[PDB]
Design an enzyme around this catalytic site. Structure first.
Site, mmCIF file in Angstrom:
data_model
loop_
_atom_site.group_PDB
_atom_site.id
_atom_site.type_symbol
_atom_site.label_atom_id
_atom_site.label_comp_id
_atom_site.label_asym_id
_atom_site.label_seq_id
_atom_site.Cartn_x
_atom_site.Cartn_y
_atom_site.Cartn_z
ATOM 1 N N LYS A 239 17.855 30.039 -27.306
ATOM 2 C CA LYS A 239 17.292 31.589 -27.176
ATOM 3 C C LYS A 239 18.265 32.271 -28.320
ATOM 4 C CE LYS A 239 15.918 35.617 -25.012
ATOM 5 N NZ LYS A 239 16.062 36.100 -23.712
ATOM 6 N N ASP B 281 18.592 40.990 -11.474
ATOM 7 C CA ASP B 281 17.348 40.907 -12.065
ATOM 8 C C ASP B 281 16.421 39.703 -11.715
ATOM 9 O OD1 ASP B 281 15.640 41.903 -14.357
ATOM 10 O OD2 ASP B 281 16.407 40.203 -15.578
ATOM 11 N N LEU C 139 20.765 26.499 -23.701
ATOM 12 C CA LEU C 139 20.007 26.510 -22.307
ATOM 13 C C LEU C 139 19.659 25.045 -21.815
ATOM 14 C CD1 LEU C 139 18.470 30.245 -22.454
ATOM 15 C CD2 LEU C 139 20.574 29.593 -21.260
HETATM 16 O O1 AK4 Z 1 11.393 31.814 -19.996
HETATM 17 C C1 AK4 Z 1 10.538 31.639 -20.692
HETATM 18 O O2 AK4 Z 1 9.615 32.516 -20.817
HETATM 19 C C2 AK4 Z 1 10.480 30.480 -21.465
HETATM 20 N N1 AK4 Z 1 11.184 29.361 -21.125
HETATM 21 N N2 AK4 Z 1 10.245 28.288 -20.844
HETATM 22 C C3 AK4 Z 1 10.777 27.149 -20.596
HETATM 23 C C4 AK4 Z 1 12.323 27.557 -20.569
HETATM 24 N N3 AK4 Z 1 13.548 26.773 -20.337
HETATM 25 C C5 AK4 Z 1 14.504 27.520 -20.417
HETATM 26 N N4 AK4 Z 1 14.851 28.626 -20.713
HETATM 27 C C6 AK4 Z 1 13.569 29.465 -21.503
HETATM 28 N N5 AK4 Z 1 13.784 30.721 -21.393
HETATM 29 C C7 AK4 Z 1 15.151 31.345 -21.607
HETATM 30 C C8 AK4 Z 1 15.709 31.436 -20.216
HETATM 31 C C9 AK4 Z 1 16.959 32.256 -20.317
HETATM 32 C C10 AK4 Z 1 18.120 31.764 -19.621
HETATM 33 N N6 AK4 Z 1 19.212 32.455 -20.035
HETATM 34 C C11 AK4 Z 1 18.755 33.953 -20.471
HETATM 35 N N7 AK4 Z 1 19.525 34.836 -20.870
HETATM 36 C C12 AK4 Z 1 19.386 35.695 -21.256
HETATM 37 O O3 AK4 Z 1 18.078 36.242 -21.643
HETATM 38 N N8 AK4 Z 1 20.291 36.751 -21.587
HETATM 39 C C13 AK4 Z 1 20.197 38.056 -22.236
HETATM 40 C C14 AK4 Z 1 18.824 38.516 -22.498
HETATM 41 C C15 AK4 Z 1 18.887 39.798 -23.212
HETATM 42 C C16 AK4 Z 1 19.966 40.656 -23.530
HETATM 43 C C17 AK4 Z 1 21.186 40.049 -22.936
HETATM 44 CL CL1 AK4 Z 1 22.813 41.182 -22.931
HETATM 45 C C18 AK4 Z 1 21.235 38.866 -22.242
HETATM 46 S S1 AK4 Z 1 17.011 33.832 -20.810
HETATM 47 C C19 AK4 Z 1 12.527 29.012 -20.899
#
Ligand code: AK4
Length: 245
Positions: free
Chosen positions: A35, A129, A83
């Site tokens: 990510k 969340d 991740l």
């Molecule tokens: O989800 C989908 O649509 C796509 N997808 N598909 C398969 C898949 N497998 C693993 N991970 C995915 N996506 C990332 C999921 C996350 C895990 N942890 C996160 N953390 C985070 O966003 N932190 C964050 C964000 C914005 C601001 C701040 Cl301060 C902190 S996001 C996957």
């Protein structure tokens, strides 16, 4: 860790703060997700410190129903998360595909959230969340909770006290309703209408939602936070015990 360590695959999802990509460690061959967060968006939204909070929280959480963060690093204007990859995508996508879930899939997912949230709370973590686009599916169809950005130590999913740990319980009941119905329970055309319905806890069930499900959701969607059903009470609930795989 640096970009140089990874081969990037296809985009997995677009977020407002950053994008997700399928990836492979070059010197382990291990499949994972990456990510990309742009500092630009983080500092303009003042969430920089939150990311550091998520990172420390995900250093302590090990549970088969929580998406792992194996690590992190930064470029010059990008922060990267390493991740666990979820091969079967988001619960949100699946709900769009199926339009609604049957009782068995709903109860099973609800059981898996509750085990996961039960583990978080025992470690003094409140997720805050809980929502379909932050629930993921592993290789064996297992629910994985992702995105610990708004964790501590749309408006449709917020409990009335947000417009401690009993917020996850309100979110859980919103989820159960959304899973069975295909729409969250306080959906309205205007922002003001939606707010009014949440504050008032003003929701109705379509006829197809069964008595067991209505009871579960009603014991979850209560204005008085401390009177909401607990995670142990959810796992022991008759409709959950009857329908869960
Ligand atoms: O989800 C989908 O649509 C796509 N997808 N598909 C398969 C898949 N497998 C693993 N991970 C995915 N996506 C990332 C999921 C996350 C895990 N942890 C996160 N953390 C985070 O966003 N932190 C964050 C964000 C914005 C601001 C701040 Cl301060 C902190 S996001 C996957």
């Amino acid at each position: 860790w640096t970009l140089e360590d990874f081969d990037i695959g296809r985009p997995l999802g677009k977020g407002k703060f950053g994008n997700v990509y399928l990836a492979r460690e070059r010197q382990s061959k291990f499949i994972l997700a990456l990510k990309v967060l742009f500092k630009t968006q983080l500092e303009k939204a003042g969430v920089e410190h939150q990311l550091r909070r998520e990172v420390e929280i995900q250093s302590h959480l090990r549970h088969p129903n929580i998406l792992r963060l194996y690590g992190y690093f930064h470029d010059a204007t990008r922060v990267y998360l390493i991740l666990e990859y979820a091969p079967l995508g988001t619960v949100y996508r699946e709900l769009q595909k199926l339009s609604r879930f049957d009782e068995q899939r709903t109860a099973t997912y609800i059981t898996e959230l509750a085990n996961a949230l039960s583990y978080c709370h025992s470690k003094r973590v409140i997720h805050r969340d809980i929502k379909p686009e932050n629930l993921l599916l592993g290789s064996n169809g297992e629910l994985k909770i992702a995105d610990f950005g708004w964790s501590v130590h749309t408006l449709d999913y917020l409990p009335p006290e947000m417009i401690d740990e009993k917020v996850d319980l309100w979110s859980l009941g919103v989820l159960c309703y959304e899973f069975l119905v295909g729409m969250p329970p306080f959906e309205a055309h205007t922002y003001q209408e939606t707010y009014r319905r949440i504050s008032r806890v003003e929701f109705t069930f379509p006829d197809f939602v069964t008595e067991g499900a209505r009871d579960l959701i009603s014991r979850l969607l209560k204005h008085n936070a401390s009177q909401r059903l607990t995670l142990a009470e959810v796992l022991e609930h008759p409709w959950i015990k009857a329908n869960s795989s």
